[PDB]
Design a protein around this ligand. Structure first.
Ligand SMILES: CC(=O)N1CCN(C(=O)N2CC[C@](c3ccc(C(OCc4c(F)cccc4C#N)(C(F)(F)F)C(F)(F)F)cc3)(S(=O)(=O)c3ccc(F)cc3)C2)CC1
Length: 213
């Protein structure tokens, strides 16, 4: 890939992300000061685990629709066979949503944007998944403490999705060429913005895979 083709791949991935980012960053950042009161937190804690599961599963389904649209707008992804497109989305959609979450996470007070306001992990107590919730918050904190930008989320999530190691891929080598190109685009963008120093602080390769499995 040429240095011009890579700059075009960066722009192409960031364009797809911009069209499918679901929530405006500026609205998430403005709402940081709008925090749930103790009464509102208690209201969530009193809900049944079934009600919390219905709300969260609904928000998760909606977030996954935007990730599918992000994938459909990557010309590289659309050149893959139907089997591989399904395999990559089924294995990676949830991991992409997990990376996207860091933009809605406030590392100053350990809160996340949820249904209109920011709240801590105790908001999700009725689910009875405190170890899972803790892990999600820790993963978000590790990216949020790096001030992970919109273009870094765009390039990183494209890499999360285009993974040649996913079981069931019919054209592994085609996926790998697209993955290698996306890694070059990611590193190139980090150099132009003097952000290469985040590479050594980024979560290890399969941390998302183990968290989501
Ligand atoms: C584009 C953007 O700016 N976004 C920020 C706002 N959005 C967002 O945070 N989410 C969309 C749906 C949000 C969501 C929904 C459900 C889940 C749950 O775990 C899914 C899961 C596993 F089952 C296993 C391993 C990892 C994960 C993950 N991720 C599920 F079981 F209910 F499905 C849960 F157990 F954690 F609840 C996880 C996040 S959410 O806002 O409701 C929310 C819920 C919990 C939480 F700790 C934080 C938030 C995650 C959407 C993305």
């Amino acid at each position: 890939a040429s240095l011009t083709e890579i700059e075009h791949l960066v722009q192409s991935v960031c364009k797809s992300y911009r069209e499918t980012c679901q929530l405006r960053l500026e609205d998430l950042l403005r709402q940081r000061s709008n925090i749930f009161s103790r009464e509102e937190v208690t209201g969530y804690q009193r809900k049944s685990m079934w009600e919390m599961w219905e709300r969260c599963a609904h928000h998760l389904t909606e977030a996954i629709q935007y990730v599918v649209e992000f994938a459909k707008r990557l010309s590289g992804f659309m050149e893959l066979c139907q089997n591989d497109q399904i395999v990559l989305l089924k294995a990676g959609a949830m991991e992409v949503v997990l990376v996207r979450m860091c933009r809605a996470y406030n590392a100053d007070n350990r809160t996340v944007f949820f249904e209109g306001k920011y709240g801590g992990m105790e908001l999700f107590r009725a689910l009875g998944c405190s170890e899972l919730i803790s892990s999600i918050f820790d993963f978000s904190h590790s990216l949020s403490a790096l001030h992970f930008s919109e273009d870094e989320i765009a390039l990183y999530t494209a890499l999360v999705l285009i993974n040649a190691h996913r079981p069931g891929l019919q054209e592994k080598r085609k996926v790998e060429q697209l993955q290698y190109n996306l890694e070059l685009a990611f590193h190139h963008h980090l150099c132009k913005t003097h952000r290469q120093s985040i590479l050594a602080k980024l979560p290890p390769k399969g941390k998302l895979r183990s968290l989501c499995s």
